[PDB]
Amino acid sequence: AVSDIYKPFWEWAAKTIKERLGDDLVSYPIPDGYLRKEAMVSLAWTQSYGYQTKKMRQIRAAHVNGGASLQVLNLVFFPHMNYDLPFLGLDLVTLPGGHLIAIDMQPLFQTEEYKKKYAEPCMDMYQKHVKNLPWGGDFPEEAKQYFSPVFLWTRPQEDKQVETYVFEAFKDYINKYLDFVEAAKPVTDPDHLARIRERQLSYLQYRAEKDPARGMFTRMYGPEWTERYIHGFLFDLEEKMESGEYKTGELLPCSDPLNFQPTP
Ligand SMILES: C=CC1=C(C)[C@@H](CC2=N/C(=C\c3[nH]c(/C=C4\NC(=O)C(C)=C4C=C)c(C)c3CCC(=O)O)C(CCC(=O)O)=C2C)NC1=O
């Protein structure tokens, strides 16, 4: 089977991020010791990528490769909390038991107004892709509040379906999301900002505590590295807020040159 089936996914996302965000794009600080992590399982490695703009607090990816039986691309766009933009969540998981694919613009709110603003303009795109990406099935209850009407949840059973149908939805959702980002305007109403902050923290807290990545990273690299990776990078909002680092709509200082390729 394809050993690194998400390498073409990442390469496309990197090219698109770089082109469409241009000079607004700067590196996001990747904590030392979490850029590249390797352990024997064959050699299995985790490669980190991180970026930010004045609208995107954090665009970060974990690309895990431990052979065909263990592949993950976890790519999430986190808006700054002075925007009501949804998250863009792209979880692509390949395990011995098959493929797991979760692609969504995870919403801050489930109101009629929010759905009209962000979900309804995506419905043709959703219906185009869901025809070849059937519903994946049973789904944890607590997570339901964090998914939109255009959630693509599917379990492809052949590599080819990932390389074709999933890849095309992957691209379309990223391009549509960045269209939203381009057009988004800041929120200045303090009441709305307070609610945006609450919903962002709720989502971040759920995934930091409940994401199945915790269990897998723990087996691979142990508990101490895993918790630092999860709370310190993958879902780091609460830490950055509590430490006084996060400032609404402001970039975190980082002088690292932009990187889009594996770092040995
Ligand atoms: C908001 C919640 C949300 C999710 C749960 C994930 C999206 C997601 N990932 C899932 C499942 C899942 N995900 C992984 C593994 C990983 N997922 C990752 O992002 C990384 C980096 C992994 C490994 C290192 C594994 C091993 C499973 C299977 C766990 C199991 O079989 O019990 C599931 C199904 C979980 C289940 O059935 O219980 C979802 C929905 N992303 C999200 O945004």
Author numbering: 3 to 43, 50 to 272
From the paper:
BV IXα is then the substrate for many members of the ferredoxin-dependent bilin reductases (FDBRs) that catalyze a regio- and stereospecific reduction of the tetrapyrrole pigment. However, during the reaction, a second aspartate residue gets involved and likely serves as a proton donor for the proton coupled electron transfer to the A-ring of the tetrapyrrole molecule. This reaction catalyzed by PebB is a formal reduction of the 2,3,31,32-dien system of the A-ring of 15,16-DHBV. Here we solved the crystal structure of the PebB homolog PEBB (nuclear encoded proteins in eukaryotes are denoted with capital letters by convention) from the eukaryotic cryptophyte alga Guillardia theta.
The substrate-free model of mGtPEBB was used to determine the structure of the mGtPEBB–DHBV complex, which crystallized in space group P21 with two molecules in the asymmetric unit. Both chains showed clear density for DHBV already after molecular replacement, even though chain A had overall higher B-values and somewhat lower occupancy of the substrate. Electron density for the vinyl groups defined the orientation of the substrate in both chains. DHBV is bound in a niche formed by the central β-sheet on the proximal and by helices H6/H7 on the distal side of the substrate. Because the mGtPEBB–DHBV crystals were grown at pH 8.5 and appeared in similar purple color, the observed alternate conformations most likely reflect this deprotonation of Asp-99. Contrary to this hypothesis, we identified a flipped binding orientation of DHBV in GtPEBB based on strong density for the vinyl groups. This results in an inverted positioning of the A- and D-rings.
